[PDB]
Amino acid sequence: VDVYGNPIRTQQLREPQTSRLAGLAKEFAQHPAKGLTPAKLARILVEAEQGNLQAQAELFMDMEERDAHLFAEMSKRKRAILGLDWAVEPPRNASAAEKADADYLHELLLDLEGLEDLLLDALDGIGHGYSCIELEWALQGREWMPLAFHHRPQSWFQLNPEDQNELRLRDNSPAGEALQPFGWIIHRPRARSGYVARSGLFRVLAWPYLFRHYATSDLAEMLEIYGLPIRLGKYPPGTADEEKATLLRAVTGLGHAAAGIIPETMAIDFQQAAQGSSDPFLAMMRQSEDAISKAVLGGTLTSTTSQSGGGAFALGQVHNEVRHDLLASDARQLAATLSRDLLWPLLVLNRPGSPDVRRAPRLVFDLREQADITSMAQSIPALVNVGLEIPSAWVYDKLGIPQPA
Amino acid sequence: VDVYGNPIRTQQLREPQTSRLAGLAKEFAQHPAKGLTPAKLARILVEAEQGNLQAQAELFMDMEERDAHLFAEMSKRKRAILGLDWAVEPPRNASAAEKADADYLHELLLDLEGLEDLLLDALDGIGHGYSCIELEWALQGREWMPLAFHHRPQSWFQLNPEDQNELRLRDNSPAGEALQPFGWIIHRPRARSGYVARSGLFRVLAWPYLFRHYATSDLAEMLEIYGLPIRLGKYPPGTADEEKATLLRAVTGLGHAAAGIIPETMAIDFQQAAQGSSDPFLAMMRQSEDAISKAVLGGTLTSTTSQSGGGAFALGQVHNEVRHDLLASDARQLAATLSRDLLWPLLVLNRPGSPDVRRAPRLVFDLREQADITSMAQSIPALVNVGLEIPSAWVYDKLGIPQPA
Amino acid sequence: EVEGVFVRATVERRCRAGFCFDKEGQGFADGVLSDEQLEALESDPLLKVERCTFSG
Amino acid sequence: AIITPALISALKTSFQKHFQDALATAPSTYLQVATVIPSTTASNTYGWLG
Predict the structure, then answer these.
(1) How far is B337 from chain A (nearest CA, A)?
(2) Distances B37 to B72, B209, B280 between C-alpha atoms, Å
(3) Minimal CA separation from D24 to chain B, in Å
(4) Taxonomically, which superkingdom (chains A, B) (predicted)?
(5) Which of A147, B41, B67, B243 would give a disulfide with A136, using CB separation of 3.0 to 4.6 Å?
(6) Contact A98, A343 (CB under 8 A)
(7) Segments of A93-245 assigned E as strands
(8) Is the CB of D25 inside 8 Å of chain B's CB atoms?
(9) Residues in chain C within 8 Å Cβ distance of D9
(10) Strands B259-263, A230-235: parallel, antiparallel or unpaired by DSSP?
């Protein structure tokens, strides 16, 4: 069975759950970001709270695509995880059989192509609040294998009417369809405590995005109007339609044309077009960008930048507060999700027996922080000459150097 | 029994208390932050003081979601705790049986999945003033286990009419329902001395949030109006309705249109639209953000930033004042809550006998601060050559290096 | 019952014809009629004022 | 004194939302006299042969 105890039947693993839903694969995103107003955004969020996640997912995708600063921040945050070395470790004080199981799982993950793509797809749940990856199960003889990992759009799911924390497929029915066991890797990182609909970071970032969009569009319009002044022509009674058209064309082309002549009975008045500055717009854009930076990566390095300054402890100063905390949180949550969803089916299908769930191997990301070799290498000799018996295992582990074999 | 002495009956542990309240699970948040005015906020707070916590909880959730700066500060503060290593220690001068009990509890917590989620859910009480997590109890033979931890919204509870410090479930009755023993982990951090309703940090942070919201909305409106000037057209007596509509459309499109012509008998006056600056709005936003930073994380590193500057003692300078105090306070309160709520039921159900409550093991968070290895390693040799017999236990404990085994 | 009376021989501004002079008239704290004229007539006292229960 | 406290009633008066929802339905009773028969159809039918 799975970790949650639901019965597992190997018959349903031959075909993906969504195969019998050919309607989903033919859908196109509705792009709800175009022509978006604060009222529309509020309605979208409220409806999403009630189980209509399609519009929210499409809006989040558009928001990711249309904002360069937000996209850069999210990409940097995800690439931070994608570059971490990982390993599979056996449970606490594991036995020989458990060690062998962990070693086999580690070897299987090393030789499993598409792991990086799986991690990238799973990390989308950081912003979207939940990411679902469908599994393709195949048999190369007697051992089950994940053939491929398919990332399904968040717009394909909904909320259970009887449960606000349980996701279901959109199968044209009011209650949707329950997710098949062992058929998905659902990643639901928890930045804030609440239901799944409210758990996305883009829900926090939506309003600054709209503020920045409005400011940028208004600035573009004002830059378009800038330049020549608006000038209005006046004509006396008894001016025919042809003369009216001639005066109109003359006024229209007068800005580009340096000189022109009109009868003394006519008049042209040059009125202010748009006089001001870009200061308000740019102030709003900077405020929104700082808010986005703080919300995504913390207000110590991105928005209120940590500035330059090297040194042996500079790595620690830059990392440990804020950056290390965020990195560790994301890595630990991703590792927990993976150990729950991918490691367990492999252990319970590819190996004999029914090992207890509490003793399953856990995927661990390498969060080791580079320690100053020079300072500590200076420090040891004094301590050892004093008489302290420092274990070599601690040194080898903390320095990153492996133990002799 | 529990720590408070209330009789404990194992019959009620088979089902959650809220299972017989299927009405609660079908509710949706009312979103009281939309269209919020200072009078409405004052009424919400006053009503919450009197036992109506639903509106206050929903307002706090909206406040958390809609403010990026506040959300970033709270997330950073909580992630600070989530990254701390923890251990279970036996009581003062504990005996062999007590040491065995503590070791078994430590092993059980290590192998208990969902601990990080439990800590995150409990830390919500920092801002909300109280967090309730429901327990699922199951028997794997002869030993009780927490199957899962469920975080219930603060909107599901109320105040006892006869007691302002005791929370109760909303069961449609005036007096609510008392909380089941051993069925919840209630975390109520105490930033300020008072009743539970007034104990939330969001109660302090509400007013700066409203100030910032008003300033941002006003700035957005003023940016919308900025650009072209308002221009008013005037027409003489004897202008028909069709000519009036033509003049109105001409005036409406005149700002975008560089040129236009009107009869000499008409007139168009270009009046100031909105002339000023973003300085007042931005000043208010900065004031509110500084207030929020000071209230959440202290006015030494976040609002009045500590600036750069490394060194061996830089860690101490940045941490010990403000940051270390807040970290230690939060960690100690969370550890006390956990030791009270989760450790005790495990000890009194999973082990024989009736150990005295005063001798229960206590969960301890690792608050050890990194000490300068180089300076102290320089220092020891002089002291030891002088003749001082410094214990090795103090060195091993303070450096973080473990004693040889 | 009417709450409002001034019975300390106290002075109040009552205007007879072109001038406002000491006199005690309405002298009540409740009003239903002649409010605009009462304001001029009901100028709070100059000297010691004490209230009673006429109950009229 | 004050000329017209009559019109200033709106500002002074406060709100005490204590009579709001100060009621509830009668305690559930169908459990004692009736048994739940969960179903998922449009017209459930029962059959017994005597």
Answers:
(1) 18
(2) 24, 12, 20
(3) 6
(4) Viruses
(5) A147
(6) no
(7) 131-139, 144-152, 157-160, 163-169, 177-178, 184-187, 230-235
(8) yes
(9) none
(10) parallel
